[PDB]
């Protein structure tokens, strides 16, 4: 529905939608901007990510509420299951949409480390969200798709980015959550978080005051998880 709107107008309205906390609109505007076919700037990538993180975040929270009610019930009839299935299907649709944008054609055109790692982190995240609700023949393949995207992103970020780079840190944080919550590998999650934190600590001395704030913010999230896991 966005094909008739200018790319720059879509970006401007995505920013307005964020201010209005209209994240479904924000996502539709950024989907339209992606489909114009041009690569995305750093700021534009953030807008895309923020929009869909909010949309799917609301869906995941609702799914967890309903899944919990459904587990307690296991006679109220089919309603809790039916409605959990409806939310689940809508969530899977959003994840498929984001993954489709990455595959057509954001990732293949992303040549710089900053953009390619960003998109591969996204790919890992949205397969992780699919894995959270998966139960059928493809649960293992979904998990391996998340793992593979995260791993490629990790390999690039370790080669091409300093240990304090916020995207590198956020990727490691989320990959560690993947290990702990999805892959049943809590020791791998703990080891990754610790090594990521320690390598960043040792590189903080190179940073400006503003970069220091950006990096230590995410380092605290790694620490919070380690405190919860150990």
């Amino acid at each position: 529905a966005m094909g008739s709107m200018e790319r720059a107008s879509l970006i401007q309205k995505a920013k307005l939608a964020e201010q209005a906390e209209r994240y479904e609109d924000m996502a539709a505007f950024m989907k339209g901007a992606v489909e114009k076919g041009e690569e995305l700037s750093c700021e534009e990538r953030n807008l895309l990510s923020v929009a869909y993180k909010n949309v799917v975040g609301g869906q995941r929270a609702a799914w967890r509420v309903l899944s919990s009610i459904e587990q307690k019930s296991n006679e109220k009839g089919p309603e809790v299951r039916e409605y959990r299935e409806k939310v689940e299907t809508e969530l899977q649709g959003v994840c498929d949409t984001v993954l489709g944008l990455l595959d057509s054609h954001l990732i293949k055109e992303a040549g710089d480390a900053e953009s390619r790692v960003f998109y591969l982190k996204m790919k890992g995240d949205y397969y992780r969200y699919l894995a959270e609700v998966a139960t059928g023949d493809d649960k293992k393949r979904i998990i391996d798709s998340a793992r593979s995207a995260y791993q490629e992103a990790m390999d690039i970020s370790k080669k091409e980015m300093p240990p304090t780079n916020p995207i590198r840190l956020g990727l490691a944080l989320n990959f560690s959550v993947f290990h702990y919550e999805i892959a049943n590998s809590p020791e791998e999650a703990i080891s990754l978080a610790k090594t990521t934190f320690d390598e960043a600590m040792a590189d903080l001395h190179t940073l400006s005051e503003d970069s220091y704030k950006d990096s230590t913010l995410i380092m605290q999230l790694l620490r919070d998880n380690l405190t919860l896991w150990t």
């Binding site: 920013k15 964020e18 923020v50 993180k53 975040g57 956020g170 944080l173 959550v177 998880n225």
Partner: peptide, 9 residues
């Protein structure tokens, strides 16, 4: 266990 919040640009 917290992932990146990532909900504010």
């Amino acid at each position: 266990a917290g992932s990146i919040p990532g909900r504010r640009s």
